[PDB]
């Protein structure tokens, strides 16, 4: 792919299901000025991904406190995303979301980020930390069965922000 540490993260423009339940076309560049956590999950209506998606959504305020936007993505259609959002949580659904969920039906965003599982047209569990200038700072890719940690993601975002500011602090 085109995701390289220290280089601009690949832009994308894609339809997402937004927290209000409506569809909107969004771009990574919409979020310049904020840190971004951009994470891929394989498919809707699965059993490892909902733990991650719900954790990032439940804890969205902790990312907001770090001026950090979280965005999820999968190759499944935006209609499929909303169907899972609208599935009651007690039946295995996501429930209302605090983060947008991008649809990548052409697989070009996963390819751009180097996380397409080519023999099975879905993304690996890629997670990318992009700074406020659009520069890629961190790459995480898990094989399909193993999920990610919101605690670890917050540790990384905060640490990148602290090290960003080091030489810019008052010299008193």
Residues that bind a copy of itself (CB under 8 A): 5-6, 117, 124, 137-143, 145-147, 149, 152, 155-156, 159-160, 163
Q: Are 31 and 63 in contact (CB under 8 A)?
A: no
The residue with its CB nearest to ligand YC0 is 170
Nearer to ligand YC0, 146 or 170 (CB): 170
Nearer to ligand YC0, 133 or 155 (CB): 133
To the nearest whole angstrom, how small is the minimum distance from the Cβ of residue 6 to a copy of itself?
6
Residues contacting 165, CB < 8 A, separation 6+ = none
Nearer to a copy of itself, 56 or 124 (CB): 124
With CA atoms as reference, report the closest residue to 84 among 116, 54, 126, 119.
54
Compute φ and ψ for 159, nearest 5 degrees.
Answer: -65, -40
Q: Which positions touch ligand YC0 (CB under 6 A)?
A: 169-172
CB of 170 to ligand YC0, least distance (A): 3
DSSP E strands, the chain:
13-17, 23-27, 35-40, 68-74, 101-103, 116-117, 122-123, 125-130, 136-142
Q: Which is nearer to ligand YC0, 34 or 59 (CB)?
A: 34
**Least spacing, CB of residue 79 vs a copy of itself, in Å:** 28
Q: Which residues of 103-116 are buried (b: 16+ CB within 10 A; e: fewer)?
A: bbeeeebbbbbbbb
> Closest separation between CB of residue 132 and a copy of itself, Å?
14
Q: C-beta of 99: minimal distance to a copy of itself in Å? A: 22
Structure tokens at 39: 């994470």
Residue 152, binding choice from a copy of itself, ligand YC0, none, Cβ under 5 to 8 Å by partner class:
a copy of itself
């Amino acid at each position: 792919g085109n995701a390289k540490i220290g280089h601009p993260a690949p832009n994308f423009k894609a339809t997402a299901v937004m927290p209000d339940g409506q569809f909107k076309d969004i771009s990574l560049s919409d979020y310049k000025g904020k840190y971004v956590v951009f994470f891929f999950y394989p498919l809707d209506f699965t059993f490892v991904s909902p733990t991650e998606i719900i954790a990032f959504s439940d804890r969205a305020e902790e990312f907001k406190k770090l001026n950090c936007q979280v965005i999820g993505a999968s190759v499944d259609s935006h209609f499929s995303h909303l169907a899972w959002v609208n599935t009651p949580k007690k039946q295995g659904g996501l429930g209302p979301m605090n983060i947008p969920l991008v649809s990548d039906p052409k697989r070009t965003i996963a390819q751009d980020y180097g996380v397409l599982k080519a023999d099975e047209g879905i993304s690996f569990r890629g997670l990318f930390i992009i700074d406020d200038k659009g520069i890629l700072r961190q790459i995480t890719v898990n094989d399909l069965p193993v999920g990610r940690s919101v605690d670890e993601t917050l540790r990384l975002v905060q640490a990148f922000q602290f090290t960003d500011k080091h030489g810019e602090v008052c010299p008193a």
